[PDB]
Amino acid sequence: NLRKVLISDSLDPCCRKILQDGGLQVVEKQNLSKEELIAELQDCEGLIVRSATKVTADVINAAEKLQVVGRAGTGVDNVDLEAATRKGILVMNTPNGNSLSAAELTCGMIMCLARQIPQATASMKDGKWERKKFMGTELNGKTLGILGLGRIGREVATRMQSFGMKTIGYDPIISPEVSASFGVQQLPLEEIWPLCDFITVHTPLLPSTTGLLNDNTFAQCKKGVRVVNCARGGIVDEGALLRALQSGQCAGAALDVFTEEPPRDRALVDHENVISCPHLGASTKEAQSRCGEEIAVQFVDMVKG
Amino acid sequence: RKVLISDSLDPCCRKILQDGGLQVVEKQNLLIAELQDCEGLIVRSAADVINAAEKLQVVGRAGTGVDNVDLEAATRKGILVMNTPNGNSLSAAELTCGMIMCLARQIPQATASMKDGKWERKKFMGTELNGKTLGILGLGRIGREVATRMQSFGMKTIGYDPIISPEVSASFGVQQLPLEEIWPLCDFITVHTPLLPSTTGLLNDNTFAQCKKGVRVVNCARGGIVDEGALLRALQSGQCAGAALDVFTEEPPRDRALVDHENVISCPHLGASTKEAQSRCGEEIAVQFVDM
Ligand SMILES: O=C1NC[C@@H](COc2cc3[nH]c(C(=O)N[C@H](CO)c4ccc(C(=O)O)cc4)cc3cc2Cl)O1
Numbered sequence: 001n002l003r004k005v006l007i008s009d010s011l012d013p014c015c016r017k018i019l020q021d022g023g024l025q026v027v028e029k030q031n032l033s034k035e036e037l038i039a040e041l042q043d044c045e046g047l048i049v050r051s052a053t054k055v056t057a058d059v060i061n062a063a064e065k066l067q068v069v070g071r072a073g074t075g076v077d078n079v080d081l082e083a084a085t086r087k088g089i090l091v092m093n094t095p096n097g098n099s100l101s102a103a104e105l106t107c108g109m110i111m112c113l114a115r116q117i118p119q120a121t122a123s124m125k126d127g128k129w130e131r132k133k134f135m136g137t138e139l140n141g142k143t144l145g146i147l148g149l150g151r152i153g154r155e156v157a158t159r160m161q162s163f164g165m166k167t168i169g170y171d172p173i174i175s176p177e178v179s180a181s182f183g184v185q186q187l188p189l190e191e192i193w194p195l196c197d198f199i200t201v202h203t204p205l206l207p208s209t210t211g212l213l214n215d216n217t218f219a220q221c222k223k224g225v226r227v228v229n230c231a232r233g234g235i236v237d238e239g240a241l242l243r244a245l246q247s248g249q250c251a252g253a254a255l256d257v258f259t260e261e262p263p264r265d266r267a268l269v270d271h272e273n274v275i276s277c278p279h280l281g282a283s284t285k286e287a288q289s290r291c292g293e294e295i296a297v298q299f300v301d302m303v304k305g
Numbered sequence: 306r307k308v309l310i311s312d313s314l315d316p317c318c319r320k321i322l323q324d325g326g327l328q329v330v331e332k333q334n335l336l337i338a339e340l341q342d343c344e345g346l347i348v349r350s351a352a353d354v355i356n357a358a359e360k361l362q363v364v365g366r367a368g369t370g371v372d373n374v375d376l377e378a379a380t381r382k383g384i385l386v387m388n389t390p391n392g393n394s395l396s397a398a399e400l401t402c403g404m405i406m407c408l409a410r411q412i413p414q415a416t417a418s419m420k421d422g423k424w425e426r427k428k429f430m431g432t433e434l435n436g437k438t439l440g441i442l443g444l445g446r447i448g449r450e451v452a453t454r455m456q457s458f459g460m461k462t463i464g465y466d467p468i469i470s471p472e473v474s475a476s477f478g479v480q481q482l483p484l485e486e487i488w489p490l491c492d493f494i495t496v497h498t499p500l501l502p503s504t505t506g507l508l509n510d511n512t513f514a515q516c517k518k519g520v521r522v523v524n525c526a527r528g529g530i531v532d533e534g535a536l537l538r539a540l541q542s543g544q545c546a547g548a549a550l551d552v553f554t555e556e557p558p559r560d561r562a563l564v565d566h567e568n569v570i571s572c573p574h575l576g577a578s579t580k581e582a583q584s585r586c587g588e589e590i591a592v593q594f595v596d597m
């Protein structure tokens with residue numbers, strides 16, 4: 001059963017600490033090339049990654065002891081889950097660990113869109129004083145649409161409520177009565193689009209949420225809507241967003257995530273009304289430490305049944 | 306009733322200034338010949354002015370304070386200066402909150418990186434606000450608005466105001482402490498005071514010396530409350546991890562050392578630059594006038 005675990009990426013020593021406390025032997029490697037990793041996994045039931053180490057069908061297939069792969073983070077981009085499940089290898093991740101960091105970044109993106117803070121800093125650093133060029137928006141009394149009312153969507157809701165934003169939204173699993181208890185009014189999507197000043201997505205990436213925002217939904221929005229995607233690349237159709245930015249149907253967007261990372265296509269990043277980060281939603285010392293801890297705790301519970 | 310308007314004003318304010326007499330002409334970029342013979346005045350931004358002026362009763366600035374109109378020359382004549390001290394409050398508080406989130410996650414620096422074709426995930430390791438301490442100096446309209454918003458993020462809000470009682474500030478969840486007890490506790494410090502002798506260099510080498518190593522500071526209030534030489538020294542040592550500045554001792558600033566620092570976020574004094582603030586000030590000034 002589960003004994004010895006390799007850590008192949010850099011995450012807080014709180015991870016190692018909890019693993020050995022629960023009986024597991026631990027080793028701690030870093031970077032490691034496609035050939036390198038497998039020579040460690042010779043003797044290992046367990047592999048903990050962050051984002052850098054790719055766990056492809058190759059490593060999975062070529063590693064003849066590996067029973068579980070743990071990601072100290074959200075989703076499994078860097079783990080071939082098709083090939084893992086084929087070989088009976090359990091894949092786990094730490095969904096709770098990043099919630100607050102992702103919600104805080106989303107709120108900062110909304111403030112940034114409202115007041116053009118990234119654009120203003122760039123203008124100051126270019127030696128300009130362009131007070132006129134900037135006219136921002138007060139959030140108080142504006143409507144924020146929240147698509148997805150799990151962990152992150154509800155944390156975004158309660159913070160933006162403090163700004164006196166009205167928070168409306170939709171989730172197919174969360175009842176209107178439960179969303180009401182954290183101040184989010186659920187309506188049909190067709191009724192959400194024309195009410196929103198700001199839209200933010202907090203859904204998993206599924207067929208049903210791939211291009212959730214598209215040409216059809218932008219057609220239904222108020223002119224000048226502002227969009228945030230701090231969830232997963234492709235929930236917002238990037239073509240449809242660029243078309244909405246060019247027409248003015250969309251007055252601005254804030255993107256932490258892209259269909260391709262890093263993105264080869266530069267048109268959205270380069271747009272004047274787009275502010276962007278290189279997938280920083282989970283990039284806080286606090287989230288990184290909580291994910292380290294959460295994966296270790298998940299591992300030890302599997303040894304104790 | 307001839308009324309000049311020496312500033313980019315909200316078009317609501319003219320559509321207002323025809324309840325009572327108001328013969329208006331909104332001429333920006335001015336200079337002094339403009340106000341020929343006019344008795345009752347409105348302004349936004351932009352003395353020698355009123356001295357060569359004639360029959361003028363009330364001057365009104367759609368904004369807070371009067372830092373673009375000589376109050377003593379106006380007191381040298383009969384002239385009452387009105388302003389709209391609540392019109393800009395929410396917009397200034399909202400910008401301050403956005404500056405706090407930008408300092409925590411370096412969103413302006415991340416955007417500049419991305420627009421250079423970079424994908425810099427390690428440089429941009431940030432801080433969670435939940436569980437951090439925000440020090441708020443000045444607990445008037447703006448300070449209390451910043452406090453209740455940042456409490457929703459799980460920040461502990463402490464502060465100091467010589468005029469606001471500890472009971473008033475406890476009612477909006479701000480614990481007042483002596484300044485000496487505030488500095489060592491703060492992860493973030495934000496200033497919401499008037500610019501007075503007592504508040505000029507309120508943050509200086511002596512106060513940075515008592516702060517936590519890595520404190521972040523915001524000034525969306527008035528240029529000079531943060532001593533700019535002291536703030537650059539603190540950024541240079543790492544005593545200050547970052548600063549967000551909407552305001553500068555000289556606007557526009559000719560000393561570029563702070564604006565050019567990698568850990569400084571800056572705006573060209575945008576705290577009151579929203580449609581809603583500019584509309585609310587245009588009308589709060591009317592009700593002060595049109596209800597003597
Ligand atoms: O007409 C329609 N076209 C397609 C469909 C609209 O698609 C949606 C599908 C959705 N799915 C979910 C969803 O799975 N929500 C749960 C929470 O209940 C959840 C689980 C995990 C996470 C996370 O990983 O952070 C987030 C949310 C929300 C959501 C919203 C919308 Cl608008 O309806």
Ligand SMILES: O=C1NC[C@@H](COc2cc3[nH]c(C(=O)N[C@H](CO)c4ccc(C(=O)O)cc4)cc3cc2Cl)O1
Nearest residue numbers: 442443444445447465466467468469484497498499503
């Ligand atoms: O030991 C000392 N070191 C320095 C010295 C004084 O420091 C202070 C002086 C202060 N003055 C005030 C102040 O005038 N506050 C009132 C609110 O009651 C106020 C009025 C208008 C506005 C506004 O225009 O938005 C804001 C606030 C706050 C404050 C804080 C501090 Cl730390 O004492």
